[PDB]
């Protein structure tokens, strides 16, 4: 599994150990393990071969607001 900034792998034959800026969602919508965030931002991810992983990543003037340094 992969998202915009993360990649994960889950083994489905193994169970896991049991041990502000969004809507609070009080209302309804209608009416063995590997995790990495080193690779980001990702356009696409997939396997080329059994041991090859293809990770595709993304590589103007602005009003100057100086940063003071002493």
């Amino acid at each position: 599994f992969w998202g915009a900034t993360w990649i994960s792998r889950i083994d489905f034959d193994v169970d896991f150990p049991i041990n502000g800026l969004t809507i609070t969602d009080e209302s309804n919508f209608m009416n063995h393990f590997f995790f990495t965030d080193k690779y980001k931002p990702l356009l696409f991810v997939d396997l080329i071969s059994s041991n090859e992983l293809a990770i595709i990543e993304r590589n103007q003037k602005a009003f100057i607001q100086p940063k003071l340094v002493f």
């Binding site: 915009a4 809507i23 969602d25 990702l42 356009l43 602005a62 009003f63 607001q65």
Partner: protein, 129 residues
């Protein structure tokens, strides 16, 4: 770069603020009109507040604060509030969305969205060849 508050019934200037260093491209206000937010070329968002009861009685706005959150121009800005939401959403030439809280704009946290969220994929790879 000036923000000016006019009286509608008389069409006269009540207050003038020289806030931004360049063009002010967009304005927005909260539901109760207690806050007015401005943004523009200078990459800053200014908050103008009239929340204090004395301010409401006198009808005087105060330049409460500003924040530098964008790497380039801020062309668009909008606000939404509800019982479970308080959003100040801005975006511009940086091509990314920035989310703030209206009530806690000065001291709240903010989120900078990824430029590309590939919900629809623009790239494919073929295992063979």
């Amino acid at each position: 770069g000036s923000i000016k508050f006019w009286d509608f019934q008389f069409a006269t200037l009540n207050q003038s603020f020289k806030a931004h260093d360049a063009d002010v491209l967009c304005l927005t206000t909260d539901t109760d009109n207690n806050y007015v937010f401005s943004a523009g070329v200078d990459r800053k968002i200014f908050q103008f507040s009239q929340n204090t009861n004395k301010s409401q009685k006198n009808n005087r706005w105060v330049n409460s604060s500003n924040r530098l959150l964008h790497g380039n121009d801020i062309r668009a800005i909008c606000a939404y509030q509800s019982k479970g939401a308080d959003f100040l959403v801005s975006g511009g030439v940086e091509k990314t969305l920035v989310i703030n809280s209206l009530t806690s704009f000065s001291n709240g946290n903010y989120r900078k969205m990824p430029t590309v969220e590939p919900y629809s994929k623009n790239v494919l790879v073929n295992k063979e060849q």
